[PDB]
Design a protein around this ligand. Sequence first.
Ligand SMILES: *C/C=C(C)/C=C/C=C(C)/C=C/C1=C(C)CCCC1(C)C
Ligand SMILES: *C/C=C(C)/C=C/C=C(C)/C=C/C1=C(C)CCCC1(C)C
Ligand SMILES: *C/C=C(C)/C=C/C=C(C)/C=C/C1=C(C)CCCC1(C)C
Lengths: 240, 240, 240
Amino acid sequence: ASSAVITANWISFLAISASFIILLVISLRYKGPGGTESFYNGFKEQNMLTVFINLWCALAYFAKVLQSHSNDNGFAPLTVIPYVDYCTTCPLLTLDLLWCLDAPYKISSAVLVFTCLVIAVACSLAVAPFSYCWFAMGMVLFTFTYVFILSIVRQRLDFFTLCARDSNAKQSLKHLKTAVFIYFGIWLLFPLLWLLSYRAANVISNDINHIFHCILDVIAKSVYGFALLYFKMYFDKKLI
Amino acid sequence: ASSAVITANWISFLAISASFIILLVISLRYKGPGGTESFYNGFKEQNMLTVFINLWCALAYFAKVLQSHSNDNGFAPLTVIPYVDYCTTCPLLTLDLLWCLDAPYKISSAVLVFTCLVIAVACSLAVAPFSYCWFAMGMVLFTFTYVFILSIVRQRLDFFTLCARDSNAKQSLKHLKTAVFIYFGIWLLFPLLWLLSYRAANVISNDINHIFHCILDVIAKSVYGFALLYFKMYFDKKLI
Amino acid sequence: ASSAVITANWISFLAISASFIILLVISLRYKGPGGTESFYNGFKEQNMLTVFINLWCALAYFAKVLQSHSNDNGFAPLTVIPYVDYCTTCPLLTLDLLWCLDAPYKISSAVLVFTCLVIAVACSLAVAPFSYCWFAMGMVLFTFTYVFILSIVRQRLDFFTLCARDSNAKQSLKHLKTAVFIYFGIWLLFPLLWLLSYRAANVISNDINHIFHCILDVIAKSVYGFALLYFKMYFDKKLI
Ligand SMILES: *C/C=C(C)/C=C/C=C(C)/C=C/C1=C(C)CCCC1(C)C
Ligand SMILES: *C/C=C(C)/C=C/C=C(C)/C=C/C1=C(C)CCCC1(C)C
Ligand SMILES: *C/C=C(C)/C=C/C=C(C)/C=C/C1=C(C)CCCC1(C)C
């Protein structure tokens, strides 16, 4: 691979590894809002989802780094077949988002995201013009899923803001809004990147697409999980 | 493919898509027995299983439609490898059946169905005479699973009928019996179709086998889910 | 295959099949500590995990037996790709271990074991020297997971021993300690077997590695599940 590609892969792998190790340490050392439960997150494993996500992401990028130094394909599921790592991760991200917010249809939303990602995987491994049909079907399903998840997220954000008066509550709400903006705005770029890649309109080269994918992953995973975590720890739920 | 095959694929895809969209609309608009919960199914995601099943089925058939118009294989998992779509769907159907009935060993029954379907997948990709051994092992496992699930279903049906006196309760019980008959009688045809296909006794041609599979899927998914849904909404549980 | 390989495969398959059928019969006939619940394990499906594990293991070995009598590869997922059967089974074993002990991070520990096994699968299908890097990463992850799971297991064993005074309680504690020793000591042999196989230091031939793998599987599944089961049935929890 090119110098830029290998450098971006190494930087992304190191960033996600550091983020995974910090998140795991914070989760293990977290003692709950009361500061008395030794294994608060042990009996509430959903709070660990973020951590696992990062770990998986890190592993994927690790494979990429190996593929960056060898002429032969590395771990095919995480390097060869596109969007499989996303198939594994994004549903967990949606489940965590709708769990911290106590939103309805968390499992349904996660399954919809997984189905959209599998449709995208089929589209990326298809041949035109059938690839166009697969992309159109995925686009309709993702539009429906996006509208549904926004409607739930907006209604939970309004509910949370209605009963948030403490300064710490306001700071946690700002972090939650930042995480929500990262989740919604950034996710819309992935379809734009696919439609702008060598597939369909070929304008952006492979290297720039890969670097943009790496940057979007790093942001929307590391910063997203950190913000979610700031919000979960520093937002009193009993204010409901 | 032949005109009959493509016509059957299109009809099945349209029927399952319409069934998925109607079931999703009904589930989203359903407000619970009391008619006061805005997200009754949101906090009870098992009631959405049916919907997801149909959606997945629809997607599978969509792939078939694409494979029906191209000389190259489409989405291999849903078109090339047989029974993989069934591997994904049937365990969910069993889980939903044993959940609406509040039956024991729902997860165990789903795992048994998944194991039987994986054994069938191995059998379909094997070479004789090892295919015969795989089929025999799958037949013993499926016989055990069928006897166990019938025994649970019959005992829950007797329990439900013991305390069902309302006219609406009787109508819901009739729909539940129709769904149970569809689940049990129709499922016995799939092994008969496999034993009658080009594998083992080659009497029925590929096209007729495909059309019969499409009809059985459409019935035992669309009508089955509609009946289950009639039963879940229009059967007061508090009569226990 | 050689006479020794086929004999070991047949013996392992028969042992695991007999163990699965005895465990399933005991679980179905078990009526709970009170001896009044007809479906005690039906509403507590975690107690069935062991059974399912054995069944899956049995199926895997069945495939091996077929591969032992044909020049062509059998069910590739359970015979060709190494550690995939382990990917399916070991996480369930860890989940069951941490569930019977009411240990924290049971799902987290299961996901860590699954990630370690997937890393091992990637390592076994890699090419040197990238295989060495994959093995090193898997070794660090497994060391962390081993230390974490030991720390949880030791703390739950101390907790259980603190309030175990009955003779039957002592007998169940002895069986639990035997199961824990099987889980910890035996698992350390698998990495030693991999490091001693044709990969890395080639000293032990393939046949001896296969026989050792079969013996370790048989012990650490059949005897492990039987001990876990002796402990779950014959240990009064109300003594907490
Ligand atoms: C950490 C990585 C994440 C959250 C990746 C998310 C990716 C998507 C939401 C992708 C969506 C796509 C479509 C809606 C259309 C088809 C192309 C995709 C896969 C880019
Ligand atoms: C919606 C589709 C469904 C419910 C399909 C179900 C299929 C089966 C129950 C198939 C069973 C089989 C056997 C018991 C023996 C081996 C051959 C099979 C796969 C047809
Ligand atoms: C029933 C079979 C079981 C429990 C198998 C367990 C296997 C392991 C814990 C294997 C671990 C390995 C490593 C930690 C390093 C890489 C090589 C492995 C897969 C042998």
